[PDB]
């Protein structure tokens, strides 16, 4: 199906060793990642603070994200919530109208007080999200009925209440109502092959805003955010050479139905890399969600020995090494050795030292051998430490000076240096083979160009085409050259330098394993350069990056883990070859997967910006903040997955108060349906008179008042109440400003009732301003305690600042019985504390006005029409009918 | 075409203009049949191509195949003497959709 699997000679042709997929290797990264540090703070002593180093299900994770998807964050409703209510008097003519929205409100999140910051901060956060989740809703479906011709709404959808204020009216205003009800016709009505129904009704403000934001968000969005959305998926298909079936998408839309669409494939893989120590996390989980499935191949029994007669065979070099067969440990060396080499710069390999093993000589010097021809240490990027390096030509040099043959002459230098010597009768110099890192003069990448550029990627972040040895991959199908001619330089000047120095029969044994090796690095390329390309790969700046870092030893932000191996496993490792036979499972699902990883850390990001200013704003109330209190509020409130997936390395540990807000400064967000209304909600609630808590309290000594009850249906028409609820405030002048600091310090000298006290004897006001207080509303018939009735802003405990207040409305009731001075009294009774807000909650309305908040208008979708989520759809197979620019 | 709905529209106004319709480029396997009556349907008013719609979440999806294979038919006359002079005139004739 594919014609670089097509095998003519039987030379490519091995024996199956193992195999290893993405989901196994994963997970066997992260444990020895994690064992490393585990064992190295158990063999010494260390002194830090206590963490547990685990290891999650990485499939269980994903699929978490995965199911993340089917979420949705509106609400499809025939009728909208009520939103006013009313209290009837013993007035005939008057009532009490209430705004709902104010009163569940008021008791959302817990009492503000002065000494628990992350309760402040989770408070507001409830807030803000219980206004984003009661703001956003559809409607459907609404009933209506006929009369004189036309189509009237159900009193049902207006958000208004008014049955318990009907026995007490009289003909006319119920005659009023019942025109005012009919008039509230449907526009548009009259007329057939609709399909929206278009009314008025009563709403409350910032639930309106969410509403027409989500109208105007439904409206807009819609095929074209597909199309773009298809292509790109077309785009990286085609870069990925996925097979496309015969089954193509077209742009019919019934007339029944209405999409919405929630994400967006164009990803800016910038909000990805922006988390601090994220690193891990990205390799994880690319590895996870990227690389194939795959068996080891080894090379044909034949190129080792052949047989002339039955007694007569050829006989190779290293015939011990070759039949020997690995254990456990040197198999998981060299498994680290292919993740080392298909991730450049990102894992590093170094030695591993243990006393435990006893091991022929011989091994080490050919592992020296090996690792020159195998690994690279050029000039662009690196794939191991400079102290294996510098073990490798150690190796190299303890391999050229052992001779078992005749011993040829040579001429050493001035330096004591490994490898600094002049062998053979033709005086081939040694001193290339020494490690230097500015050129990459001894190993892979000589004299060859290993990262280039093509064409642009649909990834923007990543654009290199890593070419390991000079190899591309097409030489698997269209060849440039005969059998002989493949070669490369490194590996010619290894082989002229092996010839130098006395040793054919390796020579030769190297000549004939050649083509094997260009395959196998022309496999790998190949691996790298198709499958592994997505958003959790290194960014090219990062990528150029990581070797100056290094060699200079500056700190850097993108460390690379490093893991250790065996002197077998080089030739363990250089003895097999990695052949893909399966993609991977979850190929053409992982966008989707990127795109609600990036949404849900904008909501994150954007909420952390929204709640960083809270200081700046109100000095007084978070006097004992931090940005980790407001960090943790943010995250307690997030789903698990994406916590999951940033969390792999237990990274949460570490991060400190810089990294945290050099996070929340950096300008990069990923937008989607949840983050427009999230950013709305927030739009909403920068008032924080629409939150119910306010510092607008005063204290002014009032009397509660005694009418004079001369004319009894008189006063009971009249509609009295009472409240300490201020229409406006009193002017700047005779008020007293009072301040946290300045109340602590006069209550700390036994001095604060004596001022109070002093005054309001002199018929002044004071104002506790600067702490938001908790604001509840409460209504009553009768006298009410003195709880509520001389309550105060402050209690005594010292004195606590923030105390809830409670606004009240008292409603006066008088019978026949009643004489005209039957409410006056010889003392009076006092009230203290008053609340100001410039919102309307309570208003004291005539009865032909009831229905005077009928100023909204509203569009609902009708009984016929179908609301269908389509960002399930949004797959990488799916090829669409007329291609887009 | 099939995108905005045009597939179907476009082929019968080329088969009222009487003109040809060509399917491709690729070569076709080629069989040859002889017949003594009325042919099977399925070779008079079949069709060289496959067109077919479906509906998956809210979308609509088509899927076109082009056929793979071709006849050839040979089709004899045979009468008897009992046959009215104007026995096999139709009032209305019968179509064939196939030209190698």
């Not at chain 1, 894992?347 to 091991?359: A, F, N, S, T, V």
Request: with cysteine.
């Amino acid at each position: 199906q594919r014609p670089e699997r097509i095998k003519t000679t039987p030379y490519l042709e091995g024996d199956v060793l193992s195999s290893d997929s993405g989901p196994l290797l994963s997970v066997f990264a992260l444990q020895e990642i994690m064992q490393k540090v585990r064992q190295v703070q158990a063999d010494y002593m260390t002194a830090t603070r206590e963490v547990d180093f685990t290891v999650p299900d990485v499939q269980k994770i994903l699929d978490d994200i995965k199911a993340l998807a089917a979420e949705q964050v509106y609400k499809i409703v025939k009728v909208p919530s009520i939103s006013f209510r009313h209290i009837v008097m013993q007035s005939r003519d008057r009532v009490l109208r209430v705004d709902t929205y104010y009163e569940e409100m008021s008791q959302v999140g817990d009492v503000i007080t002065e000494d628990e910051p992350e309760k402040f901060y989770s408070t507001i956060i409830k807030k803000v999200r219980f206004i984003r989740g009661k703001g956003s809703f559809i409607l459907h479906d609404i009933p209506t009925r006929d009369h004189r011709g036309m189509e009237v709404a159900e009193p049902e959808v207006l958000g208004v209440e008014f049955k318990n204020v009907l026995p007490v009216l009289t003909a006319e205003h119920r005659a009023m109502i019942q025109n005012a009800l009919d008039g509230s016709i449907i526009e548009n009505g009259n007329v057939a092959t609709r399909d929206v129904d278009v009314f008025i009704g009563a709403c409350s403000e910032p639930v309106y805003r969410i509403y027409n934001r989500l109208q105007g968000y439904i409206e807009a969005v819609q095929l074209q955010e597909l199309r773009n959305s298809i292509g790109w998926l077309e785009r990286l298909g085609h870069r990925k050479r996925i097979t496309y079936s015969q089954e193509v998408l077209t742009d019919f839309r019934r007339q029944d139905t209405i999409w919405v669409l929630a994400l967006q494939l164009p990803v800016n893989p910038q909000v990805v890399w922006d988390v601090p120590r994220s690193s891990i996390a990205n390799l994880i989980m690319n590895i996870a969600t990227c690389l194939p499935t795959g068996e080891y191949i080894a090379p044909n029994p034949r190129i080792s020995s052949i047989t002339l007669t039955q007694r007569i065979t050829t006989t190779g070099p290293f015939a011990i090494l070759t039949g020997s067969t690995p254990t456990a440990q040197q198999l998981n060396d060299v498994r680290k050795i292919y993740l080392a080499l298909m991730f450049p710069g990102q894992i590093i390999l170094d030695l591993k030292i243990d006393p435990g093993e006893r091991m022929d000589p011989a091994v080490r010097m050919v592992a020296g051998v090996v690792g020159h021809l195998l690994f690279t240490a050029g000039g662009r990027f690196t794939n191991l430490t400079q102290n294996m390096a510098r073990q490798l030509d150690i190796a190299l040099n303890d391999y050229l000076l052992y001779m078992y043959n005749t011993r040829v002459q040579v001429n050493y230098g001035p330096t004591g240096e490994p490898l600094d010597f002049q062998i053979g009768r033709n005086q081939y110099d040694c001193n290339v083979f020494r490690a230097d890192f500015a050129t990459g003069t001894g190993y892979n990448g000589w004299a060859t160009i290993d990262v280039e550029y093509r064409e642009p990627a649909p990834y923007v972040h990543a654009q290199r085409y890593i070419r390991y040895c000079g190899i591309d991959s097409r030489e698997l199908i269209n060849p440039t050259t005969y059998g002989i001619g493949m070669t490369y330089h490194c590996y010619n000047e290894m082989l002229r330098m092996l010839v130098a120095a006395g040793k054919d029969s390796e020579a030769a044994y190297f000549r004939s394993m050649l083509p094997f090796h260009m395959v196998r690095f022309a496999r790998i390329n190949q691996i790298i350069n198709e499958d592994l390309h997505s958003v959790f790969s290194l960014p090219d700046d990062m990528f150029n990056a990581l070797l100056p870092d290094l060699i200079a030893g500056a700190h850097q932000n993108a460390d690379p883990v490093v893991l250790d191996v065996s002197w077998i496993s080089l030739w363990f490792a250089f003895n097999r070859s990695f052949e893909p036979t399966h993609r991977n499972e979850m190929l053409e699902v992982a966008p989707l997967i990127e795109s609600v990883y990036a949404s849900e850390l904008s909501v994150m990001k954007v909420d952390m910006r929204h709640l960083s200013l809270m200081q700046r704003r109100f000095p007084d109330v978070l006097i004992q903040a931090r940005p980790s209190h407001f960090w943790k509020a943010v995250l307690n409130d997030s789903p698990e997955a994406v916590k999951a997936v940033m969390n792999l390395s237990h990274s949460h540990n570490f991060i400190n108060i810089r990294d945290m807000m050099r996070w929340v400064m950096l300008p990069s967000l990923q937008p989607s349906l949840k983050l427009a209304l999230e950013e709305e909600a927030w739009a909403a609630a920068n008032d924080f008179e629409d939150l119910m808590l306010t510092d607008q309290v005063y204290m002014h000594r009032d009397m509660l008042p005694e009418p004079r009850l001369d004319d009894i249906e008189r006063f009971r028409q009249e509609g009295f109440y009472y409240t300490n609820m201020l229409e406006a405030p009193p002017e700047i002048d005779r008020v007293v400003q009072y301040t946290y600091e300045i109340a602590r310090l006069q209550a700390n000298m036994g001095q604060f009732r004596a001022a109070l006290r002093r005054i309001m004897d002199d018929d002044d006001w004071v104002r506790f301003g600067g702490v938001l207080r908790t604001v509840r509303v409460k209504f009553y018939d009768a006298r009410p305690p003195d709880d509520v009735l001389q309550g105060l802003p402050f209690s005594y405990d010292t004195i606590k600042y923030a105390t809830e207040t409670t606004i009240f409305y008292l409603i006066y009731n008088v019978e026949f019985s009643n004489t005209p001075d039957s409410l006056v009294l010889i003392n009076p009774t006092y009230t203290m504390t008053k609340v100001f807000i410039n919102k309307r909650i309570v208003e004291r309305v005539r009865v032909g006005q009831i229905l005077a908040v009928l100023n909204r208008r509203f569009v609902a979708y009708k009984g016929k029409m179908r609301i269908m989520d389509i960002t399930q759809s949004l797959k990488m197979g799916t090829k669409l009918a007329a291609p887009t620019v | 075409q099939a995108n905005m709905g045009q597939f179907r529209a476009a082929l019968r106004r080329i088969m009222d203009d009487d003109d040809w319709v060509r399917f491709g480029g690729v070569l076709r396997t080629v069989r040859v049949k002889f017949y003594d009556a009325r042919p099977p349907d399925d070779v008079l008013q079949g069709l060289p191509f496959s067109y077919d719609t479906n509906e998956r979440g809210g979308l609509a999806y088509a899927t076109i195949k082009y056929a793979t294979e071709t006849t050839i038919f040979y089709l004899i006359y045979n009468v008897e003497f009992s046959n009215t002079p104007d026995s096999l005139v139709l009032i209305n004739p019968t179509y064939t959709m196939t030209k190698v």
